[PDB]
Ligand binder design. Structure first.
Ligand SMILES: Cc1cc2nc3c(=O)[nH]c(=O)nc-3n(C[C@H](O)[C@H](O)[C@H](O)COP(=O)(O)OP(=O)(O)OC[C@H]3O[C@@H](n4cnc5c(N)ncnc54)[C@H](O)[C@@H]3O)c2cc1C
Ligand SMILES: Cc1cc2nc3c(=O)[nH]c(=O)nc-3n(C[C@H](O)[C@H](O)[C@H](O)COP(=O)(O)OP(=O)(O)OC[C@H]3O[C@@H](n4cnc5c(N)ncnc54)[C@H](O)[C@@H]3O)c2cc1C
Ligand SMILES: Cc1cc2nc3c(=O)[nH]c(=O)nc-3n(C[C@H](O)[C@H](O)[C@H](O)COP(=O)(O)OP(=O)(O)OC[C@H]3O[C@@H](n4cnc5c(N)ncnc54)[C@H](O)[C@@H]3O)c2cc1C
Ligand SMILES: Cc1cc2nc3c(=O)[nH]c(=O)nc-3n(C[C@H](O)[C@H](O)[C@H](O)COP(=O)(O)OP(=O)(O)OC[C@H]3O[C@@H](n4cnc5c(N)ncnc54)[C@H](O)[C@@H]3O)c2cc1C
Lengths: 286, 286, 285, 285
DNA sequence: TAGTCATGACT
DNA sequence: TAGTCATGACT
DNA sequence: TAGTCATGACT
DNA sequence: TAGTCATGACT
């Protein structure tokens, strides 16, 4: 058997950041993710704008930004917001979700049982189960499939799409508001790629290719690529993901049973919300 | 183990000056600085103008100038201010930040622990930790990451920029006022380089390349170099740095625990307040 | 110093129907109503279409129609419903709300107190209080202002309007559906008047003259009176009223405290529910 | 030698409503108000919009509206908001502040002394003092000059102005957004007067004639009267007032000493929060 | 005394 | 949210 | 299948 | 504060 300090279930932004924070504070951590489709972290750009996250309180952002700048590096980007300019914090999403410091098993967690020395995680098709003292369940919108709670009763999914163009760079990165609580954001996510999203947040059963095409046109029109059929040519990739939401939430970080944590509910401002949860977990586990 | 009389954390203006003042007082001193980007001392000119610093009081600027002249040499510069002339005190920043009398470990202080005698400076990646009877933390705007206090709760950063032209000298060194509390200052910092800065002090998150360009255009126009593309030609270097600022302080010099000092907040009038604090450390550390 | 068998608070359809039923069952009954505006019975047509009331069950609608036909008389009207025809039961609202067998005090009930003998109905501006062994509070959407049970906590109002044109008669009476659960109804409510309504049920606070005029024009178009400026001529009278509604209840008929009953929530299907609740009150009092 | 049940200091909205509520609950109440300028009730329109007051909770606003409609009458007004319509509750300010049921001494309360039977209210320039078992201080922004609790330590003023045009009526009453979270409100406060306000709430010491003219022009433009020179023609009256505000409190209703109450802090949602505090005072005195 | 720069509330 | 006021500090 | 209405969340 | 999105009961 595998016996470690911490097992993190889920390797999206929340499970990645929480595990690496624990590993970089000295703990032995192992991750498990079944790479299921629809994960909300795949389309993420990891943009963190003060205006979007200030509702948290200085008690929460600066703890988060220090963790991210220390562990990953927070680069600041200035976006064209109208004629004025606004600065947005950024972590490279490929850097967070690609970091390999914490080993990650590509298995599906089937059960979570407590033992004398702590918790035991069961995996489909494996009579063996992993074991650790502390377990973090950061399974996004699927967290209510492994952990139960009152807060976990409000867990719902709000899906969205982002588009990444290859071999392209924007001379001006922008945030263009088009509706209440909705803004089209375009920027260079890589030195060779452009990411655009309009903030659409819809229940996955109400999402469809036609509603996705409306968001493609809004995003494509904003970088003047509408009309060229870039999707069918393989020049743009459409990125779909389900964001976890629990009304009445920055996110849900609750010790459901002694030693078993649930981390989900990050909705829109997730990278910053994950840093807080990681700061709090390294504070409460170390 | 390393065991010394004094360990100074930080080798910007404050830690360089304090360490060297303490060494010249007979003490065995060692320094630790991780050369993280954005330090507020790198764009510094070390100009000390009485109209700017006399708010300090004769009780403080006079010991400060005596220390600085004894250790480094205070040269006087005659500046053109409009139709008048003003003399500004100066120390060569290359001489203060380059002095090698105090050896400096290029490491990151991770913790400061008390031991039976003295303090233990813990460093990333080193199972061994440094030790001295007294520790001075001159970590600028990061001082509150290692030391905690009531005063240190107001520690903030005020960023600014200066421009250093290569292979150039000014026939007239000048101070040209452009706004309340604001003046553009140009002079020869070296026999081959011209330094210009406008005094802009912004919260680092509100700084951007467009905000920097207003300060470049102001500074270039002051030496008739705007329009010639000196930046893209590599003829001028832009120097960005974060000043440590605390509302309500010449600077902050406080013994947080017996033998543990915090030294920061020297945003306004830094070299002169650093000379004062160093004069005080020489008197109060045995 | 007045002491009777039953005091019925509220003289709308439910309080009128229950009081008169109790009076004819032998009991000495008196009513109290402050004639406050917005009462839900004023626009009422007392139309009862089987399709609308069948959900309650024959165990309830059959007693109600028996009580109503005994006391008031139930008439059948044939309505044009599309290409088909349908029969609707009817009681004259002027006969139910105008009946004088039970006298009615025109005062506002301010409180309901228990006494050695029974319940005491306190009246605004009068130190004397009315007294009866039983009190039935049929106060429409205001019943929760005098009785404070749990069920009455969901009591809300669903407002609507009906229009009565004067000196007019319809050769064809109709139920013409225009949206899900919504139909415009025109018929002869009197031998000299036409009554029209579209079934709109809006929260009273979200009601306004623009929304009322949308219901007027829907109703005028249904009787070919749009274009004639009937409103500015004073040819049509607008009748606004708040229906009492409680989710999960034909209506609420509950003895909250001994001898103290709450009767409300009859939303749409009020006359048939009022006949039912009165049948039970005649049995239980 | 005046001795009553309750003495209410302050005759703006909070003391007016509380005094009249206590008087109608059987208590003998008198008021004292020195008619000092800058009171926050003079520019008041007594508009109560659910979107603004629901943060209070049904447990407070519904009791409050029941009291106001019982004592004064709550009218509903439909306002044009954008292309939509919204309902706002209303009480006539002339009815609340002009009611004469509770007599009001026009004197300045200079001190509050405890006596064996109750509290003694001293009046400037007057040797004798009034006395009552309970005293409510509803002194708006000056309440902390007579009661010195810790909560009253945050009592500050938020000034504003409203404009009443004479011999004018609006065909459409409106709430027009002019910035995020800022709206100009226009309506007919009387059958012969139009009231307009823009909701400006400023530290009283930063108010001046120039800043007032900015609100006059915003309000005049909103009713298409900019350019007619209504101010210098005497056709519009400017009404300046200080709202009492305490950060962290619907309003402050506290029994500071046995029988001595403080009632203030109703800057946002004043008439409705005064209705709530009055319901509680009738319950607790 | 002014312009610069920041912070907070938000019918 | 975003976007507009309001308020205050401060080579 | 559908059209109201109402009620709240919402970088 | 406005448009977008969800939910639920309904002559
Ligand atoms: C269009 C779009 C744009 C976005 N933009 C931004 C942005 O600008 N900035 C930002 O910070 N965030 C952004 N996000 C991210 C947003 O914050 C999401 O809420 C965030 O990705 C939540 O990630 P998570 O780790 O909570 O969930 P997920 O990424 O869904 O992680 C859950 C993981 O759990 C695994 N898992 C679940 N159940 C099991 C199981 N039983 N066994 C094993 N593994 C399991 C899944 O495989 C998955 O990898 C964006 C998202 C979208 C869709
Ligand atoms: C544009 C500009 C112009 C200026 N002009 C002048 C001028 O004309 N005259 C003047 O006197 N001053 C000037 N200054 C300087 C100003 O006074 C600054 O306040 C001063 O440099 C502050 O220096 P410091 O030593 O406190 O901070 P810093 O120089 O930032 O020193 C802090 C040091 O600590 C190190 N450090 C931090 N944390 C750790 C850790 N955990 N472990 C190890 N090392 C650590 C950092 O690497 C850094 O070197 C200017 C500054 C700027 C930006
Ligand atoms: C547009 C429209 C169309 C309708 N069509 C029909 C139809 O076709 N068929 C049908 O059967 N019904 C119809 N109705 C009526 C509907 O069924 C109502 O639900 C019914 O009228 C409810 O009546 P109620 O007696 O329960 O309430 P109300 O009629 O409101 O009676 C309550 C009475 O209590 C009084 N009251 C309240 N508080 C006090 C107090 N403190 N003191 C004294 N008195 C007090 C009020 O003055 C009022 O008179 C219609 C209603 C409307 C608005
Ligand atoms: C521009 C504007 C618009 C408004 N619009 C509305 C609206 O739409 N709806 C609404 O409900 N409200 C509105 N208000 C009112 C707001 O709610 C006020 O906060 C409210 O009027 C406060 O009432 P109060 O009774 O506490 O204070 P005030 O009316 O100020 O009453 C205090 C009274 O105390 C008296 N007093 C004080 N000290 C003494 C003393 N020592 N001796 C004797 N008398 C004394 C004063 O003379 C004064 O009469 C508005 C106000 C303004 C300025």
């Amino acid at each position: 058997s595998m016996k470690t300090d911490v097992i993190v279930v889920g390797a999206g932004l929340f499970g990645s950041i929480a595990a690496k924070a624990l590993a970089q504070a000295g703990l032995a951590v192992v991750g498990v993710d079944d790479s299921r489709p629809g994960a909300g972290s795949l389309p993420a750009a990891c943009l963190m704008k003060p205006s979007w996250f200030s509702s948290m309180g200085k008690d929460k952002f600066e703890p988060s930004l220090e963790l991210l700048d220390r562990i990953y590096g927070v680069k600041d980007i200035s976006f064209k917001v109208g004629l004025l300019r606004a600065t947005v914090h950024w972590c490279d999403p490929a850097q967070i979700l690609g970091d390999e410091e914490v080993p990650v098993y590509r298995e599906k967690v089937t059960a979570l049982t407590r033992t004398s020395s702590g918790w035991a995680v069961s995996l489909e098709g494996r009579e063996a189960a992993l074991e650790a003292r502390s377990v973090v369940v950061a399974a996004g919108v699927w967290t209510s499939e492994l952990v139960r709670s009152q807060a976990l009763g409000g867990l719902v999914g709000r899906a969205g799409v982002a588009f990444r163009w290859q071999d392209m760079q924007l001379e001006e990165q922008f945030i263009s508001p088009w509706a209440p609580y909705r803004q089209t954001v375009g920027f260079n996510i890589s030195p060779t790629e452009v990411w655009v999203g309009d903030g659409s947040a819809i229940k996955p059963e109400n999402w469809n290719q036609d509603r996705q095409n409306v968001s493609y046109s809004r995003c494509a029109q904003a970088i003047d690529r509408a009309g060229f059929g870039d999707q069918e040519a393989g020049r743009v990739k459409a990125l779909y993901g389900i964001r976890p939401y629990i009304a009445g939430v920055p996110c849900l970080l609750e010790e459901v049973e002694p030693g078993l944590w649930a981390l989900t509910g990050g909705a829109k401002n997730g990278t910053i919300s994950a840093g807080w949860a990681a700061s709090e977990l390294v504070r409460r586990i170390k």
